[PDB]
Design an enzyme around this catalytic site. Structure first.
Site, PDB file in Angstrom:
ATOM      1  N   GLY B  10       0.824  -1.197   0.000  1.00 26.14           N
ATOM      2  CA  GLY B  10       0.000   0.000   0.000  1.00 26.14           C
ATOM      3  C   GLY B  10       0.862   1.252   0.000  1.00 26.14           C
ATOM      4  O   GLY B  10       0.480   2.288  -0.548  1.00 26.14           O
ATOM      5  N   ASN B  11       2.033   1.154   0.621  1.00 26.49           N
ATOM      6  CA  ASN B  11       2.965   2.273   0.688  1.00 26.49           C
ATOM      7  C   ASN B  11       3.657   2.479  -0.658  1.00 26.49           C
ATOM      8  O   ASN B  11       4.245   3.530  -0.909  1.00 26.49           O
ATOM      9  CB  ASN B  11       4.000   2.030   1.793  1.00 26.49           C
ATOM     10  CG  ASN B  11       4.748   0.723   1.616  1.00 26.49           C
ATOM     11  OD1 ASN B  11       4.145  -0.329   1.392  1.00 26.49           O
ATOM     12  ND2 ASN B  11       6.071   0.780   1.728  1.00 26.49           N
ATOM     13  N   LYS B 127       0.357  -2.069  13.762  1.00 20.12           N
ATOM     14  CA  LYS B 127       0.472  -1.676  12.361  1.00 20.12           C
ATOM     15  C   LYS B 127       0.218  -0.201  12.097  1.00 20.12           C
ATOM     16  O   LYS B 127      -0.864   0.320  12.374  1.00 20.12           O
ATOM     17  CB  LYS B 127      -0.447  -2.515  11.464  1.00 20.12           C
ATOM     18  CG  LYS B 127      -0.321  -2.149   9.972  1.00 20.12           C
ATOM     19  CD  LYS B 127      -1.111  -3.086   9.072  1.00 20.12           C
ATOM     20  CE  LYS B 127      -1.106  -2.607   7.615  1.00 20.12           C
ATOM     21  NZ  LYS B 127       0.256  -2.606   7.010  1.00 20.12           N
TER      22      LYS B 127
END
EC number: 2.7.2.2
Lengths: 309, 309
Positions: B10-11, B127
C-alpha cells in the site's frame, strides 16, 4: 431453479439511522427474506443501490479535503460503497445461510459499468444522494458548483448525473460465478461509471434498477425483481377506482402509461425497467413487489405485480 | 504456468502523492510488470495492502463524524479500501493487458479474513497506517485514546491491532475464478477482519504478506511473492561481510535470524511469511524481490531471494 436478479434499495438499507451498525442490522432482516427465496429453489443474483451512502461518503471526502488528504472523485466513492455495502450484505447473507444450514457461497465482485459519455444525464443531473438539507444549506452548498433539487416536504438533496448503463465490464466473471452456483452481489450502487474501451471513470451514479436490468440481460436471468414499498403496483391509489395490478402484459402497461398512470419520478422508471427486460428476450418476466412479499413467496406463488409478454 | 501470489504494498501505491490519480498512475506502472508475468504463461493471483489509504479514510470518517454522518468502523473502512484500491488496480490491469494485446479478465472479490479474537494483537496495536505526524501532532492525535508510534527519521503514525489470518472466507470462490483463468484480486488491505463462524467484524488491519501467505496455502499456489525495494535480501549492509542472499533454505534463514539479522518491523515479517509458506506444503517456493525484477522475469527465471527447503 429460476434465475432472478434482485436490486436492493440503498435508501432501504439506510432508511433512518446512518450508522454502519443500523444498516448492517437492516440487511440482517433483508437476508432472511433472500434466504427464503433460496429455500424455494430460486437462484439468487443480487445488486444494490447506494444513494444515501455515497452522498454521506462524499461529505466525508469534503470535510477533510486537503493536499495531504485529498477528496476521492465520485467514481472512486461509488467503488468504496461497493466495498462497504457489499461487505455488510455478504456478511449478513452468510450468517443467515449458516444458521439455516444452507451450504451456499456468497461473493461480491467490484463492478465497472460502461456508459455513453454523450448521455443527456451528464448535462441534467437528477439522482439525489446524501442527506436532506434546508433551502439555506442547499444554497450555501451550491456555491461549490454542486446542484441541488428539492423533494416536496422532505428537503433539498445534491443531485448527480445518472447515465444509462450500456455494458457491464465484469459480466463474464459474474456469469462464471452464477454457473458455479455462487450467490453474487454485483453492480453495487449501480456500478462504477466508466466510458470508452479504456474504461475512464466519470463522476455519476447509475440507477440500480437499470443496472440490474442490464445485468439480468447479460447473465440471461429468468426474472428481474424490482422492489417497491408495497405488495402490488397500485393505480388510482386512494380513489374509488383504486386497483392493484397483479398479472399484466407489456401492452396493458403501455395502455396504463398512456392513461397517465405511474408517477414519473418513482413508479414510471420501475415500469420502464420491467418493460425493457420483458421485451429483451422471449420467456422473460419482471416482478415489481416488496422485500417482505418475496419472503412469503411459496414455490411459484409470486405475489406482486408480474409483467410478461 | 505457476500459480503465483503477489502482494502489492500500500505504501508503494501511495508513495508521495495521496491523490486518487497518483495512486491509479502508480498501479498502471505496477501492472505493466504484472502483465509481464502473465506473458510468461503464469497464473497471477493478486493481493495488496492499504496502510496509507485506510488511515487517510479513517481521518475523513473522523472529520465529519456526527449522528447524521457517523464515522465507519475500521473493518468497514478496510472493506471500503478493497473497493477503491481494487477498482484502481483492476482498471490498471485491464489497461496494461489491452496494451500487451492479451485478452484476460480481471476481477476483484471482497474478502473477509478470519482471525483469532484471542490474538495478542488486540491488546497490542502495532500496524502503522495513515500519514506521518510530528511528535507534537501525534500527541494531539492521542488525546482521544488513539496510539501513535515513531518510525526513526520518518515521523509518527497511528497503529492498530494486526492479528494473524487463520482463514479466508472466500477461498473457494477465489479458487473457482483461478480455475477459470480469471486474474483475481482478493484479500485487499489484508482482508476485512472477522472472527468466529458468524464472521463478526472486528477493528484491525491485517498484514498483506501474511494474508497472502494464507491465500497462497488455500489456493495451493506454487509461489508466494513478497515485494521489497531491493533485488535481494541483504544482510550486513555496508559491511565487509555484507551478503545478498540468492537461494536460501528455511534452515539457513533461521540460522541468520538466530544471528540477529533482518529488521523487526520490515524484513523479519517478510522472512517469517516466506518460511511459513515453504514449510506449509512440499514443493513450494517464496520469492522476496522487487516489482521491477518481476517485470524482467523470463519463464521461471527471476532475480531475487528465493526460499525453499
Amino acid at each position: 431453479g429460476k434465475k432472478m436478479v434482485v436490486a436492493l434499495g440503498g435508501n432501504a438499507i439506510l432508511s433512518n439511522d446512518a450508522s454502519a451498525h443500523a444498516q448492517q442490522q437492516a440487511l440482517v432482516q433483508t437476508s432472511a427474506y433472500l434466504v427464503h427465496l433460496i429455500k424455494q429453489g430460486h437462484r439468487l443474483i443480487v445488486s444494490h443501490g447506494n444513494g444515501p451512502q455515497v452522498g454521506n461518503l462524499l461529505l466525508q471526502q469534503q470535510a477533510a479535503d486537503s493536499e495531504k488528504n485529498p477528496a476521492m472523485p465520485l467514481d472512486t466513492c461509488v467503488a468504496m460503497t461497493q466495498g462497504s455495502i457489499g461487505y455488510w450484505l455478504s456478511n449478513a447473507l452468510n450468517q443467515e445461510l449458516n444458521k439455516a444450514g444452507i451450504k451456499k457461497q456468497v461473493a461480491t465482485v467490484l463492478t465497472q459499468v460502461v456508459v455513453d459519455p454523450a448521455d443527456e444525464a451528464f448535462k441534467n443531473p437528477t439522482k439525489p444522494i446524501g442527506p436532506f438539507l434546508t433551502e439555506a444549506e442547499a444554497k450555501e452548498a451550491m456555491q461549490a458548483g454542486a446542484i441541488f433539487k428539492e423533494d416536496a416536504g422532505r428537503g433539498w438533496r445534491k443531485v448527480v448525473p445518472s447515465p444509462k448503463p450500456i455494458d457491464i465490464h465484469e459480466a463474464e466473471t459474474i456469469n462464471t460465478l452464477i454457473k458455479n452456483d455462487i450467490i453474487t452481489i454485483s453492480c453495487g450502487g449501480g456500478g462504477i461509471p466508466v466510458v470508452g474501451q479504456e474504461l475512464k471513470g466519470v463522476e455519476a451514479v447509475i440507477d440500480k434498477d437499470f443496472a440490474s436490468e442490464k445485468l439480468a440481460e447479460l447473465v440471461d436471468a429468468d426474472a428481474l425483481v424490482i422492489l417497491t414499498g408495497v405488495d402490488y403496483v397500485c393505480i388510482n391509489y386512494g380513489k374509488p377506482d383504486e386497483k392493484q395490478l397483479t398479472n399484466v402484459t407489456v401492452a396493458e402497461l403501455e395502455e396504463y402509461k398512456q392513461a397517465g398512470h405511474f408517477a414519473p419520478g418513482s413508479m414510471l422508471p420501475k415500469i420502464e425497467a420491467a418493460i425493457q427486460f420483458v421485451e429483451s428476450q422471449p420467456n422473460k418476466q419482471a416482478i415489481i413487489t416488496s422485500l417482505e412479499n418475496l419472503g412469503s413467496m411459496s414455490g411459484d406463488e409470486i405475489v406482486g405485480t408480474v409483467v410478461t409478454k
